[PDB]
Design a protein around this ligand. Structure first.
Ligand code: TQL
Length: 208
């Protein structure tokens, strides 16, 4: 049911660096995940122009943010193109290798963590706040999968037994104890306004 994999070394290093660097401007993680969601929504929207049956797994194109204080989780849901098994195990990490490498050179040369997105690797900024990240994702061409990592050099992928999601990606951030401010309605709004106000899809905050 469950396979465990090692991160590429460079990504495993970016991850320790993100978990072990004192860096207080942690809010930018939301911006980056909303930005990944937006690119995924662009992609399915574009593909649907030539093949409208790609939207048979769901027409609405949106981002839901879903704080949950009792679980200490923040879930970002998009109805973008989703990820295949190859994407999760291989292809995205292969792509992220070069940008991770540049990003770390850039940090050594004075850049700061907030520029992570310009290297295509903003996803791993989740680890500024999350001790564990679960990604549930469904691409039209594939089954539903659950990726998960608490960093420390590995991640698992398994096919996902739970509720079907149709098409898309759900990123479930298990927050560090000291990061629970990112579960507050006001704080999330503030972040979204400040950082994500030009995203061309509806972002809905789910209030508890
Ligand atoms: O396809 N779904 C993706 C994705 C995959 C490849 C490039 N950009 C976004 C995705 C990845 C991370 C994330 O937080 C949300 C997403 O929808």
């Amino acid at each position: 049911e469950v396979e465990t994999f090692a991160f590429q070394a460079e990504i495993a290093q970016l991850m320790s660096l993100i978990i072990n660097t004192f860096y207080s401007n942690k809010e930018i993680f939301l911006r980056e995940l909303i930005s990944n969601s937006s690119d995924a929504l662009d992609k399915i929207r574009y593909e649907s122009l030539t093949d409208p049956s790609k939207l048979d797994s769901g027409k609405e194109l949106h981002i839901n943010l879903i704080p949950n204080k009792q679980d200490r989780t923040l879930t970002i849901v998009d109805t973008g193109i989703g990820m295949t098994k190859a994407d999760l195990i291989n292809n995205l990490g292969t792509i992220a290798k070069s940008g991770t490498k540049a990003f770390m050179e850039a940090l050594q040369a004075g850049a700061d963590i907030s520029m992570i997105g310009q290297f295509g690797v903003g996803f791993y900024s989740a680890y500024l706040v999350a001790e564990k990240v679960t990604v549930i994702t469904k691409h039209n061409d594939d089954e539903q999968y659950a990726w998960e990592s608490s960093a420390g050099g590995s991640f698992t992928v398994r096919t996902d037994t739970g509720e079907p999601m149709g098409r898309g990606t759900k990123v479930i951030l298990h927050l560090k104890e000291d990061q629970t401010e990112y579960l507050e309605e006001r704080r999330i709004k503030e972040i979204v306004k400040k950082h994500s106000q030009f995203i061309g899809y509806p972002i809905t905050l789910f209030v508890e």
